[PDB]
Design a protein around this nucleic acid. Structure first.
Lengths: 129, 100, 178, 91, 232, 103
RNA sequence: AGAACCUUACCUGGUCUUGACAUCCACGGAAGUUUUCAGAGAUGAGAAUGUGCCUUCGGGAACCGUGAGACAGGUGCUGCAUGGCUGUCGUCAGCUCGUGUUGUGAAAUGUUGGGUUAAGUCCCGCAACGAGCGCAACCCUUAUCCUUUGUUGCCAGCGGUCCGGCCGGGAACUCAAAGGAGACUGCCAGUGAUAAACUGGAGGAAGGUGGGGAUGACGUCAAGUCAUCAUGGCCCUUACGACCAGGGCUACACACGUGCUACAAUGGCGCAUACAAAGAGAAGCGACCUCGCGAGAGCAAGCGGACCUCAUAAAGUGCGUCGUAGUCCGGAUUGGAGUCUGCAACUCGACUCCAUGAAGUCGGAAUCGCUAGUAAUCGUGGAUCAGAAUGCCACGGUGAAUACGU
């Protein structure tokens, strides 16, 4: 229970901070417009897909601040950032969002560059004879 | 091994202090851009032969422990093989196996 | 080798349409890891298709992926002094991926001023079954109809199933000679 | 690209040898090993015998070569011609 | 001849280091080379005592030696004079004045290095070596521990080949990261060149002699820990 | 708010060692002064070294070593002179360096 | 892991022999500093500052010059002479100890079968019984997620107010490092010889011991180092030592290995446009500063790096443009100017930039890593580091085909 509810939306080493409240449907992303940051991009349809899905695009007002990651990925982190914050609209809510896959953090985690190998696993290439 | 790389390391420190201390900013003052219509006189830059061995360009050091050439590391005063040898017996502070 | 059968990672319906057939496609469209570029190209192709016929944006895309499809692959498994070949049936996941790969192999040399136009246009061709991978589907079936004579280590293998207290018919299972 | 940056060079090493040589007009080849060092007005009509790592090469200084180093006239490396490799053993 | 040296991998967890100082990177090499010099030149001065280990520490303006011994009195000597002559010459060697304490004495009959010194000594004196390696293992397991590996090298009996032998008994784990396990590689001489004994001896799988702290930040230290929450 | 006179920050390589030595300074600062704060964790640095694993040749196999350095700050909002006295009278460590210069 | 000298094995030219580095003695000088001149510089003479240290007040140590030895020194040879240590197969999936029985014994058996696994993992069991090593474990690291700290960290909300944590003020909030939490083939269902175990079911970031790493039994291989370093046998020690300069590995004729970057358009071009992580910075970087064409530059407060800087992160995003013609890709060459570290930048050094401009249209023989944060591809930082990174090492962006079958 909170004044304006909050999600952390951590995905693939990016953290989307996302404060949701009641309003008229508006967006602020990294203190600018949707148009500015994700101008004529598929990234614009990403952040919009979970707000269309639980049918509240035109009813949630939003403030978003986001760090780390790649721009197409930050939209992806926002997709969890919105869904983190919604949990109490209904009791089944996080469960159904995880089933649609848009809570789900990308469970694959880094492997470090290894010693004597040219990448994480690539052992050196030699023909030597 | 060689005594010549140990002899070098000892010779540089009296000669760093002797040639170099007077000469510190002297390359910049008499030659470079700070000499804009000032100095630019050969007779005050013919003096950089003396600091030649005492140069930042010869502080390649190599090992202090053994005097052993090639593959050096300033942070130990050592090389690849000799780091690993001290590390095996736990002689280097903070040093552990890496995992991540 | 290999004690048991292991599965595979799964690719997930695209964020702009909700399609598995798009999500498998974007993956064989990937160049130098750059899947978000191959996304703009896939979806910009689909709007160009929708301009040839507005009745579905996915219409010619989906049927191209039926019409250019390989069902079969050719394997080699020695018989004595000679290797020969045995066709084997391909799994749906690779049937789809071979067929999409071939549409995109052709589309990237087509010389139109954008991969979105090139690709949409090579779906127009392969949609009617007149294009570049119609011959490639036919050639792959020609090998499977021609090579129906040979089998995998054929002279010893025919004894081996009946002798290992296996059946009187070729056992598709580990530790029978195959 | 490379230069000589910003300072003024006459070489300390060339200075004592040149100073005594110029007074005579010309004298016996000046034994120089300092081939990193550039040529200057002071050195014109003298003969600088230039260590090349193996031996000295006499270089005559004259007005057209003051734009150059001693090491530039004086060789180092060998270029192996390419008609055929040596094949065989010798008895 | 496979494997990383066993004690090399443990030094970040539940085993402490062979030296403990801080020198802020640039002076880290001059301090390691001095720590190495005080190790090299000091073990020769206490040649007449018996010792299992040496642990050297550099606080500010001071060098503090901890030393491990077969018994409490040996290094101490007569009226404290013997250890005061150690601290005099560590001060001469070091780039600081010096302090010295003797540790608590623990398992001197089982230590890695005081057993490997004993086995080399046979080789130094050219005995037939017929029973030697087995009698090493027998007495080491008779006096304590839970497993021992011995490996002997040096061209045995004076051969013009390499000629090894080894013997492991009970439990000797190899890749272990938790607890101490005591290993020593001796190097020592005889008539024909270098001979050497390797002693892995094993006391336990759990040693608590270094562990992570008991508590989170909030219950440890100060009762009143709380902040104002603004008012810049 | 109060003004920070002087800054005591603790640097050590062992990750367990730094938290324990810091907590005793924090306690020493509360018991002998009036204006203390909970130690800000502050980000940890790591250096990467690579060497051979055999004495000579055998290029493929290598060895990799890490060394961490952990920084703790405390942040005494006003240190009393009796805290600076006690730090300086009771000094003997090698495992932590305390830096008493400020920034 | 950073080759103009030095470094750095070599070669040439210069120079001396207890020695360019220590200990010891005989004789002169304090060493240290500042400075002219001869000599390439090594090295020497001389000037000028200083007379410390100890002293039958001779003389000497430190350190240097000079001379012997004991000795320092030696990339001096032998890796069937070695010590120390590690590589190969290979995460092979095996290796062995105690002990009984069967054989005259060498040796078997157990270590092999049935069932099951990543595994000699584990159920059943035969004259094999009991047990240990590797594998198993402790272990770090991360993920979500609970939690505390609250600056050199932060600001859903509210106030002063351009709506900037600058400040009245806030903990909701990432966020950093640490207490840790979760996942156990444990529950439940099916299969499986009762069984380990595989798969399903449910919540959750995640179900197959969560992702990642640590992590390799014993050993032939006569592997490989005498050059980290120990070291016998064994040689010069006016040297198989060492200082100073110049040249050299990176030469060039090509072949062969590897990686980068490319051959395209998934892109390049122009104009506009975006968010990093992690770390490094007392030979070093560096605010402010003025100079500069971008980069940079010299000066300097300063730094200890969650403060300031490297750093302008790049691919990617927007619009128009381009079609296999070496171009609208690729930019090497080379001419010139502006900048840098140093006696010195020509062959063997760095950075920016203007103009033109070749090889290469995805390579026959040949040739390797890879099961998923993997392979692929892009940039960044770092160890080394005067000045050199395509390498190596770690970090973050975007991130795949399939694993049927033996």
């Amino acid at each position: 229970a909170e004044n304006q509810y909050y999600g952390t939306g951590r995905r693939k080493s990016s953290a989307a901070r996302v404060f949701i409240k009641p309003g008229n449907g508006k967006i602020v992303i990294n203190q600018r417009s949707l148009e500015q940051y994700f101008g004529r991009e598929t990234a614009r349809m990403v952040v919009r897909q979970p707000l269309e899905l639980v049918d509240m695009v035109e009813k949630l007002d939003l403030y978003i601040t986001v760090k780390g990651g790649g721009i197409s990925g930050q939209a992806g982190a926002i997709r969890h950032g919105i869904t983190r914050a919604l949990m109490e609209y209904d009791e089944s809510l996080r469960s159904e969002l995880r089933k649609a896959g848009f809570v789900t953090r990308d469970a694959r985690q880094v492997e470090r560059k290894k010693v004597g190998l040219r990448k994480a696993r690539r052992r050196p290439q030699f023909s030597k004879r | 091994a060689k005594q010549s790389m140990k002899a070098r390391e000892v010779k540089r420190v009296a000669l760093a202090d002797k040639y170099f201390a007077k000469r510190a900013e002297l390359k910049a003052i008499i030659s470079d851009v700070n000499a804009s219509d000032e100095d630019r006189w050969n007779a005050v830059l013919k003096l950089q032969t003396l600091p030649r061995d005492s140069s930042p360009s010869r502080q390649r050091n190599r090992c202090r422990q053994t005097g052993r050439p090639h593959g050096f590391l300033r942070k130990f005063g050592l090389s690849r093989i000799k780091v690993r040898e001290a590390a095996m017996r736990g002689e280097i502070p903070g040093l552990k196996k890496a995992s991540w | 080798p290999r004690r048991r059968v292991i599965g595979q990672r799964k690719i997930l319906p695209d964020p702009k349409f909700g399609s598995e057939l798009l999500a498998k496609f974007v993956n064989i469209l990937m160049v130098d890891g750059k899947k978000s570029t191959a996304e703009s190209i896939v979806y910009s192709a689909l709007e160009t298709l929708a301009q040839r016929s507005g009745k579905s944006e996915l219409e010619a895309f989906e049927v191209a992926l039926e019409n250019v499809r390989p069902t079969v692959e050719v394997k080699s498994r020695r018989v004595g002094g000679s290797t020969y070949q045995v066709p084997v049936e391909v799994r749906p996941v690779r049937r789809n991926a071979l067929a999409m790969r071939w549409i995109v192999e052709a589309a990237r040399k087509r010389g139109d001023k954008s991969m979105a136009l090139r690709l949409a246009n090579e779906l127009s061709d392969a949609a009617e079954n007149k294009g570049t991978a119609v011959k490639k589907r036919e050639d792959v079936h020609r090998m499977a109809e021609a090579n129906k004579a040979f089998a995998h280590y054929r002279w010893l293998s025919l004894r081996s199933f009946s002798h290992q207290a296996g059946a009187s018919s070729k056992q598709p299972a580990l530790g029978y000679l195959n | 690209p490379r230069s000589l940056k910003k300072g003024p060079f006459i070489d300390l090493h060339l200075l004592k040898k040149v100073e005594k040589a110029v007074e005579s007009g010309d004298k016996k080849p000046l034994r120089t090993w300092s081939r990193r060092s550039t040529i200057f007005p002071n050195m014109i009509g003298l003969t600088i015998a230039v260590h090349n790592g193996r031996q000295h090469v006499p270089v005559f200084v004259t007005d057209e070569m003051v734009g150059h180093k001693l090491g530039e006239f004086a060789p180092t490396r060998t270029y192996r011609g390419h008609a055929a490799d040596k094949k065989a053993k010798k008895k | 001849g496979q494997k990383v040296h066993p004690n090399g991998i443990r030094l970040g967890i539940v085993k402490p280091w062979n030296s403990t100082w801080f020198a802020n990177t640039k002076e880290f090499a001059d301090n390691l080379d001095s720590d190495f010099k005080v190790r090299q030149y000091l073990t020769k001065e206490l040649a007449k005592a018996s010792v299992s280990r040496i642990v050297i520490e550099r606080p500010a303006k001071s060098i503090r030696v901890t030393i491990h011994t077969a018994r409490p009195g040996i290094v101490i000597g007569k009226k404290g004079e013997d250890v005061e002559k150690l601290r005099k010459v560590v001060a001469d060697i070091a780039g600081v004045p010096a302090q010295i304490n003797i540790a608590e004495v623990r398992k001197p009959e089982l230590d890695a290095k005081l057993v490997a010194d004993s086995i080399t000594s046979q080789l130094e004196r050219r005995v037939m070596f017929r029973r030697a390696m087995k009698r090493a293992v027998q007495n080491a397991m008779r006096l304590g521990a839970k497993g021992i590996k011995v490996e002997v090298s040096g061209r045995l009996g004076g051969a013009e080949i390499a000629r090894t032998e080894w013997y492991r008994e009970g439990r000797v784990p190899l890749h272990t990261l938790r607890a101490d396990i005591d290993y020593n590689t001796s190097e020592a001489h005889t008539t024909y060149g270098v001979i050497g004994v390797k002693v892995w001896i094993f006391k336990g799988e759990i040693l608590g002699g270094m562990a992570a702290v008991e508590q989170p930040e909030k219950p440890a230290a100060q009762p009143k820990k709380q902040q104002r929450k603004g008012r810049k | 708010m109060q003004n920070q006179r002087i800054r005591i920050r603790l640097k050590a390589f062992d990750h367990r060692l730094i938290d324990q030595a810091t907590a005793e300074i924090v306690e020493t600062a509360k018991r002998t002064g009036a204006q203390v704060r909970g130690p800000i964790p502050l980000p940890t640095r790591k250096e990467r070294f690579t060497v051979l694993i055999s004495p000579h040749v055998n290029k493929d196999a290598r060895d990799q070593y890490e060394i961490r350095t952990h920084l703790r700050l405390v942040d005494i909002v006003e240190p009393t002179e009796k805290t600076v006295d006690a730090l300086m009278r009771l000094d003997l460590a090698a495992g932590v360096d305390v830096q008493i210069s400020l920034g």
